[PDB]
Write a structure and sequence with these properties.
This is part of a larger assembly, with chains A, B and C. By secondary structure, chain A is α/β, with parallel strands linked by helices. Chain A has seven helices and 18 strands. In chain A, 33% of the residues are buried. Chain B is mainly β. Chain B has one helix and seven strands. The chains are: A alpha/beta, B mainly beta, C alpha+beta. The interface between A and C is large, with 61 and 53 residues. The complex binds magnesium ion (MG) and zinc ion (4 copies). The site of one zinc ion has 5 residues of chain A, from loops. Chain B: Is a dimer. Interacts with NSP12. Interacts with host SND1.
Chain lengths: 523, 113, 131
């Protein structure tokens, strides 16, 4: 059994004078007589042979702790998002002097990029190998006619690795201290990687605290990702094996399974972006897991606290307004009451109940064609539930997915993957969800006494200049301060605005009105 | 200065074996041209060491043909796990013309060793 | 096309020396990392007569040792990888290597750990009158 690994690539079949062949196979049958080699003075050695050599058949999987085994297994690449970026390359074979080798020409990832490069390879020489540039042509397949205008305009390796590690150093610099890739057909990636990649001892980055995933050869320097400028190597990266995780056909038709929005404009980056997309599906289209966490990068606790306080506040307002006879909760995983004091009929629903308190969480999967004409009494709850059309009455809040939020990571199929502490595979946005309500109308509600020296009622409470007839925080007639209230609205205003920076959208039904709060405050 | 023939020779899978009866229904790869007379067949492609007969339903599906094969031509294609032996039988007594256009379309499709 | 070359059984081995940039300490950790040796060094043949200088144009051997080739004895060139050689490749490509009987299992660690002494031209310690 012989290897395509280091398999010679030039057509010349004249064996090497074994003093110029580093293996016992690359010796001509002039020296092997009964498995042994005998020196021959009858012919001198040769100095005229320039052959490229194959770089396939690797199967890298040593076993030491001094290097961490780069390829991560099933979970160790699912757990670690903010690193997913595609990897796929297109290749070709040579014409005259040689053929039988695979070399890269265009490289595409998850980033909407497709790098051009002239092919080069390890030619064998009587002193070592040289890294020589050889004539190139794409495969004779007619579907490679798109690959015609790429061979005469490519780029060498040095500038290419600089630009690539720098695309890294500005796109992934925001994300992680390594880099993981999705890959379908592992083989051509195996063949393509080696040119600007090197393994060795992972150590510590230069003047930085990350793990060193950059390497220089002129100096041997180790850069992270805020500090990789002209320093062009990916050193301890990662990958995620997409193919061997439950598939049959190619990635294209398996993208056609669910991922339909992904059109097919004839490029190469589409293959890696769809690799990432389909890997996202075949692990995350199911139920959200609560045992998985993430690093926070960043500022996320502000969004969390604002979301909690505003949700509680708006539910309080709608409740104390409309006086709901029954509030049919939906999709609440920890059976506690959002509003503390609420004399409303309290239920518990979800598509997946738990163990204890399942006597609360009833088994029900909502649908617009099924449960349409039952919960008309009172109101339900559609906070972050991503179903079909919302019923006639509901207090709602849906992630408008198209927003810009560098914690958003696109996925399948267009439905966004938000990366908080629990990865939300949330369905995309359309207008067909909110066809029974209208978006949120602003207000401000408070029902507590003041703090000033008056203690009792008007007019002994201090009014400082606050003029706004929309913050219905009585008392409110030109002053409307009460200290604790006014500034709070101030802060509260900030609160509201902050939410429109995440993506969550609030809507309340049309028949809501403002004067009910006014009449509530007529004490 | 005189180009030969841009092609349109299709390839299907069907039945062949070593004797009149040994032909299993799915093991061979027919290369053919649907001329004036049905899917007129030209050559066979296989992986087995030898197949001296083949069997294919007719134009409308009346009977099964008993078309013998050539002493196959030897060559090796490539599959992602290295080289792979393959044979190219011809329907015996097939002149140079269609042998040539078959080789054309074929070597076009399959890159050898 | 071309000519076949490596054994698939030592693929992994050369893999660790194909993608490595600190490949020397790497492959010595590999020799000591749960593996069996690179089972493909060119096996020469001679009368075992001559001095002990391995780096020889025509096998120059002792009665004890045994000769492999010259080129097939540096992993830096056995893997077609880049070299830290100043200018700019490895020397033993072209000659022969007669290693003494003990340490002659693998000539890679030999060529890298030892290096010819200018005095007796032999491998330093196998043997030498070096004081
Ligand atoms: Mg494509
Ligand atoms: Zn750094
Ligand atoms: Zn007040
Ligand atoms: Zn060397
Ligand atoms: Zn000495």
């Amino acid at each position: 059994n012989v290897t395509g690994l280091f398999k010679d690539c030039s057509k010349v079949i004249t064996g090497l004078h074994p003093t110029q062949a580093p293996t016992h196979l690359s010796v001509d049958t002039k020296f092997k007589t009964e498995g042994l080699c005998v020196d021959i003075p009858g012919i001198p050695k040769d100095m005229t042979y320039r052959r490229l050599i194959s770089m396939m058949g690797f199967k890298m999987n040593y076993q030491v702790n001094g290097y961490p085994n780069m390829f991560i297994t099933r979970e160790e690449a699912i757990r670690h998002v903010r690193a997913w970026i595609g990897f796929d390359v297109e290749g070709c074979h040579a014409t005259r002097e040689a053929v039988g080798t695979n070399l890269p020409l265009q490289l595409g990832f998850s980033t909407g990029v497709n790098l051009v490069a002239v092919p080069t390879g390890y030619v064998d020489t009587p002193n070592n190998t040289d890294f020589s540039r050889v004539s190139a042509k794409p495969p004779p397949g007619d579907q490679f006619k798109h690959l015609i205008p790429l061979m005469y305009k490519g780029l060498p390796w040095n500038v290419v690795r600089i630009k690539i590690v720098q695309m890294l150093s500005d796109t992934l610099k925001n994300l992680s201290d390594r880099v993981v890739f999705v890959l379908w057909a592992h083989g051509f990636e195996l063949t393509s990687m080696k040119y600007f990649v090197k393994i060795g001892p992972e150590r510590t980055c230069c003047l930085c605290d990350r793990r060193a995933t950059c390497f220089s050869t002129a100096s041997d320097t180790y850069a992270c990702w805020h500090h990789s400028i002209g320093f062009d190597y990916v050193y301890n990266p990662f990958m995620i094996d997409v193919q061997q995780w439950g598939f049959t056909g190619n990635l294209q038709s398996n993208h056609d399974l669910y991922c339909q929005v992904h059109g097919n404009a004839h490029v190469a980056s589409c293959d890696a972006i769809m690799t990432r997309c389909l890997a996202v599906h075949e692990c995350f289209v199911k139920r959200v897991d609560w045992t998985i966490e993430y690093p926070i990068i960043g500022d996320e606790l502000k969004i969390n606290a604002a979301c909690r306080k505003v949700q509680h506040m708006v539910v309080k307002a709608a409740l104390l307004a409309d006086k709901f006879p029954v509030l049919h909760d939906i999709g609440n995983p920890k059976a506690i009451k959002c509003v503390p004091q609420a004399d409303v009929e309290w239920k518990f629903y979800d598509a997946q109940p738990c163990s204890d308190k399942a006597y609360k969480i009833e088994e029900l999967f909502y649908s617009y064609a099924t449960h349409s004409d039952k919960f008309t009494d009172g109101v339900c709850l559609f906070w972050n539930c991503n179903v079909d059309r919302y019923p006639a009455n509901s207090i709602v809040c849906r992630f408008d997915t198209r927003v810009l939020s560098n914690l958003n990571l696109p996925g399948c199929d267009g439905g966004s993957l938000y990366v908080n502490k629990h990865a939300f595979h949330t369905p995309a946005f359309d207008k067909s969800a909110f066809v029974n309500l209208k978006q949120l109308p602003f207000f401000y509600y408070s029902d507590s006494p003041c703090e000033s020296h008056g203690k009792q009622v008007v007019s002994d409470i201090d009014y400082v200049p606050l003029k706004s007839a929309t913050c219905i925080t009585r008392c409110n007639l030109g002053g409307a301060v009460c200290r604790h209230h006014a500034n709070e609205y101030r802060l509260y205003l900030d609160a509201y605005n902050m939410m429109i920076s995440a993506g969550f959208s609030l809507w309340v039904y049309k028949q809501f009105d403002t004067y009910n709060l006014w009449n509530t405050f007529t004490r | 200065n005189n180009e030969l023939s841009p092609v349109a020779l299709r390839q299907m899978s069907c039945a062949a074996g070593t004797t009149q009866t040994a032909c299993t229904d799915d093991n061979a790869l027919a290369y053919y041209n649907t001329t004036k007379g049905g899917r007129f067949v030209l050559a066979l492609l296989s992986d087995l060491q030898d197949l001296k007969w083949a069997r294919f339903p007719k134009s409308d599906g009346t009977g099964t043909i008993y078309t013998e094969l050539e002493p196959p031509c030897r060559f090796v294609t490539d599959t992602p796990k290295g080289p792979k032996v393959k044979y190219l039988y011809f329907i015996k007594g097939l002149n140079n013309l269609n042998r040539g256009m078959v080789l054309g379309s074929l070597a076009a499709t399959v890159r050898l060793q | 096309a071309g000519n076949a070359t490596e054994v698939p059984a030592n693929s992994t081995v050369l893999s660790f020396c194909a993608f490595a940039v600190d490949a020397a300490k790497a492959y010595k950790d590999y020799l000591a990392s749960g593996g069996q040796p690179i089972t493909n060094c060119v096996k020469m043949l001679c009368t075992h007569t001559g001095t002990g200088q391995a780096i020889t144009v025509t096998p120059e051997a002792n009665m004890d040792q045994e000769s492999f080739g010259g080129a097939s004895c540096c992993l830096y060139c056995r893997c077609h990888i880049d070299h830290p050689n100043p200018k700019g490749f490895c020397d033993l490509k072209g000659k022969y290597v007669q290693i003494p009987t003990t340490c002659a299992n693998d000539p890679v660690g030999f060529t890298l750990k030892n290096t010819v002494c200018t005095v007796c031209g032999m491998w330093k310690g196998y043997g030498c009158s070096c004081d």
